[PDB]
Amino acid sequence: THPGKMELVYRKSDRELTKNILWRIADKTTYDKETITDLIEQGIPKHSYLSGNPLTSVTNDICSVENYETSSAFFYQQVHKKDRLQYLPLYAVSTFE
Amino acid sequence: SMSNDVLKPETPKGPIIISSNGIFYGPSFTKRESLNARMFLKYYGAHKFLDTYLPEDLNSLYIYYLIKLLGFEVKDQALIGTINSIVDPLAKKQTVRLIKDLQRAINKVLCTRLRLSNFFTIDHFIQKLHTARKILVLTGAGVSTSLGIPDFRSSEGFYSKIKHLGLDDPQDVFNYNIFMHDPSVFYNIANMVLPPEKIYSPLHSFIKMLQMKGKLLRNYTQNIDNLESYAGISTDKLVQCHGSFATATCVTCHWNLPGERIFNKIRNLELPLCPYCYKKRREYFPEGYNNKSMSERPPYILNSYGVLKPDITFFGEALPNKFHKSIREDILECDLLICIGTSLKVAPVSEIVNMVPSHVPQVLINRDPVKHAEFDLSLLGYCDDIAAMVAQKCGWTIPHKKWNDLKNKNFKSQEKDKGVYVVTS
Numbered sequence: 108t109h110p111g112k113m114e115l116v117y118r119k120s121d122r123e124l125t126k127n128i129l130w131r132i133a134d135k136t137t138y139d140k141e142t143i144t145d146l147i148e149q150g151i152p153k154h155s156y157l158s159g160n161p162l163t164s165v166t167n168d169i170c171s172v173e174n175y176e177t178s179s180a181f182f183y184q185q186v187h188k189k190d191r192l193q194y195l196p197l198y199a200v201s202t203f204e
Numbered sequence: 205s206m207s208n209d210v211l212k213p214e215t216p217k218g219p220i221i222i223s224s225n226g227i228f229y230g231p232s233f234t235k236r237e238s239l240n241a242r243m244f245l246k247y248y249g250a251h252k253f254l255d256t257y258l259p260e261d262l263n264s265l266y267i268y269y270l271i272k273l274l275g276f277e278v279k280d281q282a283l284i285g286t287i288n289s290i291v292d293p294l295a296k297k298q299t300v301r302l303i304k305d306l307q308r309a310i311n312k313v314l315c316t317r318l319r320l321s322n323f324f325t326i327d328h329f330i331q332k333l334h335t336a337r338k339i340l341v342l343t344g345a346g347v348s349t350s351l352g353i354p355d356f357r358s359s360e361g362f363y364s365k366i367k368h369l370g371l372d373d374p375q376d377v378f379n380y381n382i383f384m385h386d387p388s389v390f391y392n393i394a395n396m397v398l399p400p401e402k403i404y405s406p407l408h409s410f411i412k413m414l415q416m417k418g419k420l421l422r423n424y425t426q427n428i429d430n431l432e433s434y435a436g437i438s439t440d441k442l443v444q445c446h447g448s449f450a451t452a453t454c455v456t457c458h459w460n461l462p463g464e465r466i467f468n469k470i471r472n473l474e475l476p477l478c479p480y481c482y483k484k485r486r487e488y489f490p491e492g493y494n495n496k497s498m499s500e501r502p503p504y505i506l507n508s509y510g511v512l513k514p515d516i517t518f519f520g521e522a523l524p525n526k527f528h529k530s531i532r533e534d535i536l537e538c539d540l541l542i543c544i545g546t547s548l549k550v551a552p553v554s555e556i557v558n559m560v561p562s563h564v565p566q567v568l569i570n571r572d573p574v575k576h577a578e579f580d581l582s583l584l585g586y587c588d589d590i591a592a593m594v595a596q597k598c599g600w601t602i603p604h605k606k607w608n609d610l611k612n613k614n615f616k617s618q619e620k621d622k623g624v625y626v627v628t629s
């Protein structure tokens with residue numbers, strides 16, 4: 108999987124998280140705000156948002172003009188029926204029907 | 205001048221609807237609340253989303269509901285029933301099993317496009333064409349099938365034809381690593397991919413037409429047939445992202461020569477050989493194994509030694525520099541995106557769809573839906589039909605021979621879903 112190379116598009120970090128959570132958790136039976144937020148936010152890639160910039164990509168610059176060669180966006184946006192979570196498609200239109 | 209109002213959410217009121225508490229009913233959530241959440245996430249970032257939608261003090265049970273709030277259902281059976289009955293409340297294990305799945309959920313939304321609520325229809329697309337000064341068009345193999353050239357992935361396609369000569373992955377035929385080890389694999393089928401001469405479809409002329417009206421920002425093609433240039437598309441407007449047969453290159457000495465010079469050799473299924481490497485090659489391959497006893501070939505010499513290769517882009521190879529230079533100046537500056545006749549399976553080209561600004565409308569013209577992309581509007585059917593139909597509705601003239609016959613031809617547009625239309629005749 109070389110960067111910027113033609114490729115047919117169609118994990119130690121995982122256990123790193125399980126380790127990293129169980130550590131900050133085990134000594135406490137009452138979790139905190141800043142605790143759990145910071146516990147979530149470290150499993151989420153760097154990203155920008157529409158207020159900070161209107162030119163933000165549809166993947167939130169997780170795949171952008173600068174990083175597209177290393178883009179992990181294809182990986183996150185694919186959650187197969189095999190996967191744990193089930194994804195509910197939600198689309199609303201403004202219509203005169 | 206942010207046009208992202210359509211994508212801006214309404215700041216909801218306070219933390220989520222929970223704070224034994226509601227074991228069966230639960231703080232239920234509605235599609236508008238969920239979709240508004242997804243919008244909120246993508247609008248303000250993950251941080252703000254986390255801060256606002258959560259109480260100033262909490263437990264581990266919100267972690268499950270943030271998942272339901274974003275419109276996800278956790279499929280883990282033992283976990284469900286535990287939650288149904290129960291109400292820190294949660295175990296240590298499950299609490300981790302939760303935090304993970306929330307991160308996946310957040311990442312899936314952050315990495316997923318949200319369709320524009322105000323662009324769902326054929327008329328929208330038409331009206332947009334009139335107002336658009338920068339149009340980015342991405343064409344695949346489909347735009348050429350009407351000329352007899354089969355596409356790659358259809359049941360009638362290239363990969364199927366060679367799958368019947370045998371191979372595990374017919375795509376290996378275009379693999380770069382394999383070419384270096386065994387150039388014979390590619391050259392066996394190479395004649396099949398040789399471009400025809402001086403022809404183009406109506407759809408090519410449609411892109412030609414957009415260029416004449418000054419509305420065409422760039423045309424990115426994955427096609428190596430070079431038909432684009434014949435239809436009149438200019439060198440500055442055209443990018444062949446996958447290379448072209450225009451030239452070929454020795455993979456050892458890096459010499460470069462006019463592509464036509466190897467066309468006969470390819471028609472005859474002979475290895476095209478570099479004149480300048482032919483000296484040393486003959487020592488390693490005395491017997492003339494070049495066609496469709498290796499004892500004299502040392503471990504540091506592969507079969508591709510002294511072999512020419514066409515400048516088209518193999519899998520695992522690097523795309524032309526022009527691609528990278530162009531995308532960097534193009535993606536941000538573009539007000540419309542149309543995809544024509546491509547399954548969108550092959551990166552980085554496919555990632556154009558993921559790297560574009562959020563307000564930019566995305567339109568798909570193809571015989572099949574692209575399921576892994578969120579397209580505002582998808583017209584399903586033959587791209588020549590669909591081109592004629594659209595050109596009519598703009599009161600436009602396609603500069604093609606087959607126009608005079610097509611301009612009167614009538615097409616039926618049947619809506620199968622919102623933003624989805626089946627165009628026929």
Ligand SMILES: Nc1ncnc2c1ncn2[C@@H]1O[C@H](COP(=O)(O)OP(=O)(O)OC[C@H]2O[C@@H](O)[C@H](O)[C@@H]2O)[C@@H](O)[C@H]1O
Binds near residue numbers: 545
């Ligand atoms: N006349 C047509 N009109 C509209 N769509 C068409 C038409 N003909 C075929 N199609 C559609 O075009 C798509 C075909 O594209 P692919 O066969 O997948 O090839 P493409 O996406 O253009 O390129 C992928 C890349 O893979 C590489 O191996 C190869 O170099 C190619 O550039 C299919 O979804 C098919 O439904």
Ligand SMILES: [Zn+2]
Binds near residue numbers: 456457479481510
């Ligand atoms: Zn050479």
